[PDB]
Enzyme design. Structure first.
Site, PDB file in Angstrom:
ATOM      1  N   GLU A 209       0.833  -1.209   0.000  1.00  0.00           N
ATOM      2  CA  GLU A 209       0.000   0.000   0.000  1.00  0.00           C
ATOM      3  C   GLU A 209       0.864   1.254   0.000  1.00  0.00           C
ATOM      4  OE1 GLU A 209      -4.167   0.513  -0.479  1.00  0.00           O
ATOM      5  OE2 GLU A 209      -3.078  -1.305   0.066  1.00  0.00           O
ATOM      6  N   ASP A 218      -4.885   7.674  -5.691  1.00  0.00           N
ATOM      7  CA  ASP A 218      -4.760   6.251  -6.045  1.00  0.00           C
ATOM      8  C   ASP A 218      -5.003   6.064  -7.543  1.00  0.00           C
ATOM      9  OD1 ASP A 218      -8.001   5.261  -4.499  1.00  0.00           O
ATOM     10  OD2 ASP A 218      -7.533   6.559  -6.208  1.00  0.00           O
ATOM     11  N   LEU A 230      -8.188   6.183   2.280  1.00  0.00           N
ATOM     12  CA  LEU A 230      -9.044   7.085   1.515  1.00  0.00           C
ATOM     13  C   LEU A 230      -9.696   8.159   2.412  1.00  0.00           C
ATOM     14  CD1 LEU A 230     -10.351   7.127  -1.563  1.00  0.00           C
ATOM     15  CD2 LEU A 230     -12.330   6.216  -0.353  1.00  0.00           C
ATOM     16  N   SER A 315     -14.166 -18.109  -5.531  1.00  0.00           N
ATOM     17  CA  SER A 315     -12.903 -18.025  -4.799  1.00  0.00           C
ATOM     18  C   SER A 315     -13.138 -18.354  -3.319  1.00  0.00           C
ATOM     19  CB  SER A 315     -12.291 -16.623  -4.951  1.00  0.00           C
ATOM     20  OG  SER A 315     -12.197 -16.231  -6.318  1.00  0.00           O
ATOM     21  N   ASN A 330      -9.351 -18.799 -10.065  1.00  0.00           N
ATOM     22  CA  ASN A 330     -10.537 -17.940 -10.127  1.00  0.00           C
ATOM     23  C   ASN A 330     -10.267 -16.498  -9.715  1.00  0.00           C
ATOM     24  OD1 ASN A 330     -11.956 -20.203 -10.959  1.00  0.00           O
ATOM     25  ND2 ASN A 330     -13.601 -19.961  -9.447  1.00  0.00           N
TER      26      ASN A 330
END
Ligand SMILES: CC(C)CCC[C@@H](C)[C@H]1CC[C@H]2[C@@H]3CC=C4C[C@@H](O)CC[C@]4(C)[C@H]3CC[C@]12C
Ligand SMILES: CC(C)CCC[C@@H](C)[C@H]1CC[C@H]2[C@@H]3CC=C4C[C@@H](O)CC[C@]4(C)[C@H]3CC[C@]12C
Ligand SMILES: C=CCc1ccccc1OC[C@@H](O)CNC(C)C
EC number: 3.2.1.17
Length: 439
Positions: A209, A218, A230, A315, A330
């Site tokens: 990150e 971003d 955010l 998934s 997947n």
């Protein structure tokens, strides 16, 4: 042909001095580089500078002149200095491994348990003990061979060939090199196992990150701060500044410290974890997982939200069913791969294998550790042939010729120039070298 060698050798002496003063001066000047680890690296750089100033030049002269010309005193002294440096070097590396070990198994990972002052003394002791066990043997003539061929070299002022008795060769080797090399390798391979194993999600998210203390955007386009926190999806910058001041409780004006960042980051994760427990479709899968893949699951939620990550039902079908290899296929079949592939790759692997192997050497202090790993491994590769062959000479008198002893010894000498180059891995040291070289 003798001349070419003399250029090669002269280049070396200069590379050691240039290199090592450059390491020593950087640490002297910049207060940021003054750490416990970098105090030891200074002592390591001092041994290499004394090597390059005192040991190496006189060796080159000894080789090319084909005879010693400095008088039996500096012969004896040249040796003790030379032995002193190799002993002080390896025992500094050992101490560095131990200091790293006690750092990583403390609550303050990556930070030394020694103080600056307590460290300075550990360096003095190393040199005191090294000096005594390097010099006394040499100056007290305890090292000396008894046989005739040796005794002719002793009473001659122009022979400085190193001749020693079997027992000294063994006793000096074990204490000077084998003991600290072995403790070093044992301890430091555990310092690598400690880092790997002690990886938590916080570091994992930090790694992929990033961290910025100014406001940025971003790849979606929205305003973010800290470790991927955010502020709003509104395109107004003042709106972002407003939402930040609201969060922290201060007029930030787009500026925050790590303290304010990591407090947000901790709140962000805990809520991302809370969100997984609250969501009905995610919770069942989370209880199914081991500590590692548990962190892999939070990593996504952090990025995409609780709703979105509850989208990958297949998934999540297969992760619940432990078919890690099937679930990874997947997760590849997803817009998430297309949007951010480098992170996806890393996160998917963690689900796949269940280990941190996609995140090794990614964190800063994990890079700092590898660099320290590289100096240690190199010193091993540079001297180990010489020291083994030294022991095999004592067991088998006739296997080891002069030419080989000197050549192998000289790979050890070449080791004194490599460290400065290896520190160019560290962006702290790189920025320092350029400022000093006025680039
Ligand atoms: C040429 C030989 C015989 C003598 C050299 C040994 C002495 C002078 C040198 C070699 C390495 C040096 C140390 C290297 C590490 C530094 C850390 C610094 O923060 C304070 C001084 C201190 C602790 C130095 C003290 C002096 C020192 C021990
Ligand atoms: C025969 C020759 C090689 C002996 C000379 C040894 C030299 C290289 C040694 C002796 C004392 C040492 C210094 C002792 C004081 C420290 C202060 C520390 O903050 C930076 C390194 C520094 C400045 C050392 C650098 C190396 C040093 C200058
Ligand atoms: C047994 C001697 C080898 C040795 C033991 C301990 C410390 C250093 C040792 O070797 C360093 C070499 O550089 C010696 N070179 C000789 C003096 C020409």
């Amino acid at each position: 042909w003798v001349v070419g060698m003399g250029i090669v050798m002269s280049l070396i002496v200069l590379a050691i001095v240039f290199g090592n003063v450059l390491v020593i001066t950087a640490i002297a000047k910049f207060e940021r580089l003054q750490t416990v680890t970098n105090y030891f690296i200074t002592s390591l750089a001092c041994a290499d500078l004394v090597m390059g100033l005192a040991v190496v030049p006189f060796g080159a002269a000894h080789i090319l002149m084909k005879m010693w010309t400095f008088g039996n005193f500096w012969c004896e002294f040249w040796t003790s200095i030379d032995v002193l440096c190799v002993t002080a070097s390896i025992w500094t590396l050992c101490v560095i491994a131990v200091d790293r070990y006690f750092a990583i198994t403390s609550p303050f990972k990556y930070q030394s348990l020694l103080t600056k002052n307590k460290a300075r003394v550990i360096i003095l002791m190393v040199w005191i003990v090294s000096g005594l066990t390097s010099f006394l043997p040499i100056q007290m003539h305890w090292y000396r061979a008894t046989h005739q061929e040796a005794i002719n070299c002793y009473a001659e002022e122009t022979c400085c060939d190193f001749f020693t008795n079997q027992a000294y060769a063994i006793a000096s080797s074990i204490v000077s090199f084998y003991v600290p090399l072995v403790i070093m390798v044992f301890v430091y391979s555990r310092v690598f196992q400690e880092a790997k194993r002690q990886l938590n999600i916080f570091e994992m998210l930090r790694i992929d990150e990033g961290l910025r203390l100014k406001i940025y955007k971003d790849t979606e386009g929205y305003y973010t701060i800290g470790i991927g926190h955010l502020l709003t999806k509104s395109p107004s910058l003042n709106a972002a500044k407003s939402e930040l001041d609201k969060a922290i409780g201060r007029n930030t004006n787009g500026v925050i410290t790590k303290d304010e960042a990591e407090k947000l980051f901790n709140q962000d994760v805990d809520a991302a974890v809370r969100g997984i427990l609250r969501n009905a479709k995610l919770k069942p899968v989370y209880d199914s997982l081991d500590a590692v893949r548990r962190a892999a699951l939070i990593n996504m939620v952090f990025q995409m939200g609780e709703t979105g990550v509850a989208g990958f039902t297949n998934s999540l079908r297969m992760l619940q069913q432990k078919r890690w290899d099937e679930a990874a296929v997947n997760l590849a079949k997803s817009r998430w791969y297309n949007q951010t592939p480098n992170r996806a790759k890393r996160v998917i692997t963690t689900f796949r294998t269940g280990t941190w192997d996609a995140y090794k050497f990614c964190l800063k202090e994990h890079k700092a550790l590898k660099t320290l790993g590289i100096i240690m491994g190199t010193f091993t590769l540079c001297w180990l042939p010489f020291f083994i062959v030294n022991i095999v000479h004592v067991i088998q008198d006739n296997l080891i010729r002069k030419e080989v002893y000197i050549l192998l010894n000289w790979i050890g000498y070449v080791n004194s120039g490599f460290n400065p180059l290896i520190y160019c891995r560290s962006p702290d040291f790189r920025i320092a070298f350029q400022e000093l070289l006025c680039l």
